[PDB]
Amino acid sequence: GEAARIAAAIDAVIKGIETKFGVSTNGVLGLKSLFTANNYNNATKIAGAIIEEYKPSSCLTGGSGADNSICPWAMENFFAARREAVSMNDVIEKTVKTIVSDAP
Amino acid sequence: RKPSLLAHPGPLVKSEETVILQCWSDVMFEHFLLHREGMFNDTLRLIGEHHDGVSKANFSISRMTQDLAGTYRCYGSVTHSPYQVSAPSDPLDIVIIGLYEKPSLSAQPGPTVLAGENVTLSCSSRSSYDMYHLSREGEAHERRLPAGPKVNGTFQADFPLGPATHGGTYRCFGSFHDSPYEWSKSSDPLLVSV
Ligand SMILES: *[C@@H]1O[C@H](CO)[C@@H](O)[C@H](O)[C@H]1NC(C)=O
Ligand SMILES: *[C@@H]1O[C@H](CO)[C@@H](O)[C@H](O)[C@H]1NC(C)=O
Known part of the structure; x- marks a missing residue:
């Protein structure tokens, strides 16, 4: 029922984040804690957790040894993306907005 | 490069x-x-x-x-x-x-000295700051010294400037190790005259 609809949209967000950023949420405690009925649609919380766990700004020097999985995305979409200042954290938030909206 | x-x-x-x-x-x-x-x-x-x-x-x-x-x-x-x-x-x-108490900057022996006289600027505060920063107007390199003595219920950092050679307006700040990008309100500028 609605419980099934909730899990369907949560999995869509999880799959969306993983395929768009080229990362895996397996073992990622901060992100998995937010995959709930209320916290799975808050783009601000998810964007903040991706930055906290995957440390995208650390990809400037190759990444934090703890998780350099987001670096291919960071390089393609920010550091070597092909005027005004562009914030890395803004780009991440804007990407999460599209994943959440195109999830259904 | x-x-x-x-x-x-x-x-x-x-x-x-x-x-x-x-x-x-x-x-x-x-x-x-x-x-x-x-x-x-x-x-x-x-x-x-x-x-x-x-x-x-x-x-x-x-x-x-x-x-x-x-x-x-x-x-x-x-x-x-x-x-x-x-x-x-x-x-x-x-x-x-401008986040914490304004420390007080004083000069020893005084704010006006003859060339060659040993000056020492003293930064003091009631708050127990972890560091004191002495800034000379114009200069970028600030001088950091923790607090040495305790005078009249105020902690004080004494910055010895050595023999006098030229003047300058100095300001003073206090910081905490746990809040590194938040400093005190600037002390009132002290003009040293040689
Ligand atoms: C959604 O995120 C914002 C910003 O953090 C805040 O209102 C709160 O964390 C969340 N609101 C909810 C779940 O109602
Ligand atoms: C100033 O200080 C120096 C270094 O401690 C020492 O020679 C003496 O105390 C003073 N010298 C003067 C006043 O020239």
Whole structure:
């Protein structure tokens, strides 16, 4: 029922984040804690957790040894993306907005 | 080659005040990457303005906020090798001032001395700051000394300036190890006259 609809949209967000950023949420405690009925649609919380766990700004020097999985995305979409200042954290938030909206 | 990171008018910014972080180099970098390391790390991709044989880019903070304070560093890139970024610039700490009690700056033996006289500026406060910063107007290198004695219920850091050679207006700040980008209200400027 609605419980099934909730899990369907949560999995869509999880799959969306993983395929768009080229990362895996397996073992990622901060992100998995937010995959709930209320916290799975808050783009601000998810964007903040991706930055906290995957440390995208650390990809400037190759990444934090703890998780350099987001670096291919960071390089393609920010550091070597092909005027005004562009914030890395803004780009991440804007990407999460599209994943959440195109999830259904 | 290592770019240069500057703050205009300076790295010591007041809350809600404006500051411009300038990234520049003699090497023609098409893009500049400004990294902030602090409570909320972020990287900004600035477009390089090639002019006068120097490439430069500005990052303007219209209203200074706590989340924007931190250690900034500039990296340079060229569309030729977009994956090979330059060595970072020397770190620039953007500090928010005016958050704690204004310390008191006094001169010993006095604020007006004959050349060759040993002067020692004394920074004091009721608050137990972990560090005191003595700034000479014009100079960028601030002097940090923890507190030595305790006088009249106030902790004090005494900065010996050695024999007098030239004058200057000095200011004083206090900081805490746990809040590194938040400093005290500036002390009232003390004019030393040799
Ligand atoms: C959604 O995120 C915002 C910003 O953090 C905040 O209102 C709160 O964390 C969340 N609101 C909810 C779940 O109602
Ligand atoms: C000033 O201090 C120096 C270094 O301690 C020492 O020679 C002496 O105390 C003073 N010398 C003067 C007044 O020239």
